Amino acid sequence: PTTENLYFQGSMNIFEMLRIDEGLRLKIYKDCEGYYTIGIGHLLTKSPDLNAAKSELDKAIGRNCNGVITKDEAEKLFNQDVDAAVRGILRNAKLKPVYDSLDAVRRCAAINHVFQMGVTGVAGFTNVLRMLQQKRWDEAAVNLAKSRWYNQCPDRAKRVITTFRTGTWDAYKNL
Ligand SMILES: N#Cc1ccccc1O
Numbered sequence: 001p002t003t004e005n006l007y008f009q010g011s012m013n014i015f016e017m018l019r020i021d022e023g024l025r026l027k028i029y030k031d032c033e034g035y036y037t038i039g040i041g042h043l044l045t046k047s048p049d050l051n052a053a054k055s056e057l058d059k060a061i062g063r064n065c066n067g068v069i070t071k072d073e074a075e076k077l078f079n080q081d082v083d084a085a086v087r088g089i090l091r092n093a094k095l096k097p098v099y100d101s102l103d104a105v106r107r108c109a110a111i112n113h114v115f116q117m118g119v120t121g122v123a124g125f126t127n128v129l130r131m132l133q134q135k136r137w138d139e140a141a142v143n144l145a146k147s148r149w150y151n152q153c154p155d156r157a158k159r160v161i162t163t164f165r166t167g168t169w170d171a172y173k174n175l
Pocket residue numbers: 090096100
């Protein structure tokens with residue numbers, strides 16, 4: 001690794017990670033599963049009704065958006081969603097001990113996983129959670145790759161799985 005290469009991990013954090021996996025969109029769009037989304041991975045509603053999604057948006061931002069937000073607003077909502085994922089892990093009796101056992105980079109993969117799936121979906125992964133706690137990284141990754149989360153939308157999940165396997169940021173290099 002070059003000097004520049006050794007600096008790369010200091011440039012990566014949970015915000016940069018999710019920003020690559022989710023992208024940044026200032027207008028309402030349908031995600032890989034057809035759910036209304038905006039900003040950096042913010043799921044507005046699972047409803048097929050666009051007007052339901054616009055309603056959720058105005059509630060989330062606090063102004064009349066008509067389907068459109070600013071970069072600053074996207075960032076504020078993203079920061080809210082990241083904190084919600086972190087709080088969701090820490091208060092959960094099943095996820096917290098697993099999270100605490102993980103190194104810093106895998107803790108980012110855990111927050112990303114919860115951001116994407118929610119707490120009950122992750123805490124339901126009984127085998128993966130045991131694998132991670134036991135540092136069985138290859139097995140954990142093979143088992144995450146069986147999930148609907150990954151298989152319905154592989155491009156959004158693949159880097160998180162690799163990060164669980166390796167504990168490095170290598171999947172986020174060379175976009
Ligand atoms: N509670 C708590 C906590 C805070 C930062 C990182 C890991 C934790 O379990």
